[PDB]
Amino acid sequence: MWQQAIGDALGITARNLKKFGDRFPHVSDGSNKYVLNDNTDWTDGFWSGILWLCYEYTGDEQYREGAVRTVASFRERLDRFENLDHHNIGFLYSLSAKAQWIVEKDESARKLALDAADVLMRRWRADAGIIQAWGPKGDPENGGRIIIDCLLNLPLLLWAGEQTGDPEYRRVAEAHALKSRRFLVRGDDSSYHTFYFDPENGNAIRGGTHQGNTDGSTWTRGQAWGIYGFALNSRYLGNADLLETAKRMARHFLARVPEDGVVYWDFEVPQEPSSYRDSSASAITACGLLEIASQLDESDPERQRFIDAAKTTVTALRDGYAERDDGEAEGFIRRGSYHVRGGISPDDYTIWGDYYYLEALLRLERGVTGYWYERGR
């Protein structure tokens, strides 16, 4: 039921590794070809994650070799602090270094992940009680701004805390998760993309976005980050409130899935065929649904409902958005959107969309849960 979908991803990935060399895919821009970078963006870890997933599925060393090479690249990136002045250190190092530790217990990889966690820890702003999303400390406009995607960067910190025994990691992570729950999540179970607080005292200012249609709309990838993010933090923290929030956001998302099963870029714009989609939001949500289900009691009827929703989502992606390995295509699923409002790759491959699509497939076919936490954690 999932073997052919995975087959195409494996073939595309093998072809990509040879063509990309040491470079990393980010997004496409109007074609079936990925635009590459020299490990300088916030998405490079997704490539590493894809390679590790392919390796876990096949046992084929070609994927391992590629992943190991990206890990070496990340060692270099960390040691010269290249473009790491943001909270996406988790996206970058959980899926590469921590991933290798999870896959084969590589000690050097574990150390690299820990070193990265250390850097991310310094993004914490005591006076605001939040992890600064972007920019340097005291940034005039982003000094007290949190983004919902930060929830997916907390796993690196939580994992490091359990590895070192240092309670500060869990302390800042839970504080940030709870603050996110109170101010980023809305009363109708939708969510704001970002939220601003007074850098001095941490007072709540306003919710807003530069990506969603409007400050009060519902950017689908944002909602998706919330679904998977809150579920990942709930697992680590054993916090029933965060799990409940993940479920609430999931139901809100599911109630607004269009006819073909894959979401538009924002729930509050006309849900019309000519509008941009965001297949990556659906891929992320598929993973979040499975993560939520994995935390529910087997006697909870909603558990299977979420598992079925995830399967339906992956099937919808496979049927109407997945690329077949035709020897040319470089992405797994079409129609992801990076920055619609900015006109940046609004109908393209997104490496994160590809990673989550594959993670969902590996979860369904092999029970492989990605690299957000230890297997059995």
Ligand X SMILES: CC(=O)N[C@@H]1[C@@H](O[C@@H]2OC(C(=O)O)=C[C@H](O)[C@H]2O)[C@H](O)[C@@H](CO)O[C@@H]1O
Residues that bind ligand X in the complex, under the rule CB under 6 A: 42, 86, 88, 133-134, 147, 149, 221, 338-339
Select 133 or 361, whichever has its Cβ closest to ligand X.
Answer: 133
The distance of closest approach from Cβ of residue 15 to ligand X in the complex, given in angstroms and rounded to an integer, is 26
The distance of closest approach from Cβ of residue 176 to ligand X in the complex, given in angstroms and rounded to an integer, is 13
Grouping H, G, I as helix, E, B as strand and the rest as coil, residue 2 is coil
The distance of closest approach from Cβ of residue 149 to ligand X in the complex, given in angstroms and rounded to an integer, is 3
Select 56 or 291, whichever has its Cβ closest to ligand X.
Answer: 291
Residue 377 to residue 163: CA distance in whole angstroms: 12
Residue 274 to residue 260: CA distance in whole angstroms: 14
Residue 148 to residue 183: CA distance in whole angstroms: 10
Select 88 or 180, whichever has its Cβ closest to ligand X.
Answer: 88
Select 231 or 368, whichever has its Cβ closest to ligand X.
Answer: 231
Q: Which amino acid is at 188?
A: D
Phi then psi for 277, rounded to 5 degrees?
-105, 180
Residue 150 to residue 323: CA distance in whole angstroms: 30
The distance of closest approach from Cβ of residue 370 to ligand X in the complex, given in angstroms and rounded to an integer, is 16
Q: Is 245 exposed, middle or buried (0-12, 13-18, 19+ CB in 10 A)?
A: buried
The distance of closest approach from Cβ of residue 168 to ligand X in the complex, given in angstroms and rounded to an integer, is 22
Pairing of strands 145-147, 194-197: antiparallel
Contacts of residue 280, Cβ cutoff 8 Å, sequence gap at least 6: 221, 224, 333, 336, 337, 350, 352, 353, 356
Tokens for 70, please give them. Answer: 């990206």
Q: Which amino acid is at 243?
A: L
Select 101 or 225, whichever has its Cβ closest to ligand X.
Answer: 225
Residue 349 φ/ψ region, left for φ over 0, alpha for ψ in the -120 to 50 degree band, beta for the rest = beta
**Contact (Cβ atoms closer than 8 angstroms) between residue 172 and residue 120:** no
Residue nearest to ligand X (CB): 149
The distance of closest approach from Cβ of residue 114 to ligand X in the complex, given in angstroms and rounded to an integer, is 21
The distance of closest approach from Cβ of residue 145 to ligand X in the complex, given in angstroms and rounded to an integer, is 9
Residue 14 to residue 44: CA distance in whole angstroms: 17
Select 10 or 173, whichever has its Cβ closest to ligand X.
Answer: 173
Select 147 or 316, whichever has its Cβ closest to ligand X.
Answer: 147
Select 28 or 88, whichever has its Cβ closest to ligand X.
Answer: 88
Select 137 or 339, whichever has its Cβ closest to ligand X.
Answer: 339
The distance of closest approach from Cβ of residue 3 to ligand X in the complex, given in angstroms and rounded to an integer, is 30
Select 26 or 110, whichever has its Cβ closest to ligand X.
Answer: 26
Grouping H, G, I as helix, E, B as strand and the rest as coil, residue 160 is helix
**Contact (Cβ atoms closer than 8 angstroms) between residue 6 and residue 365:** yes
Q: Is 228 exposed, middle or buried (0-12, 13-18, 19+ CB in 10 A)?
A: buried
**Contact (Cβ atoms closer than 8 angstroms) between residue 364 and residue 314:** yes
The distance of closest approach from Cβ of residue 287 to ligand X in the complex, given in angstroms and rounded to an integer, is 14
The distance of closest approach from Cβ of residue 267 to ligand X in the complex, given in angstroms and rounded to an integer, is 16
Residue 39 to residue 24: CA distance in whole angstroms: 6
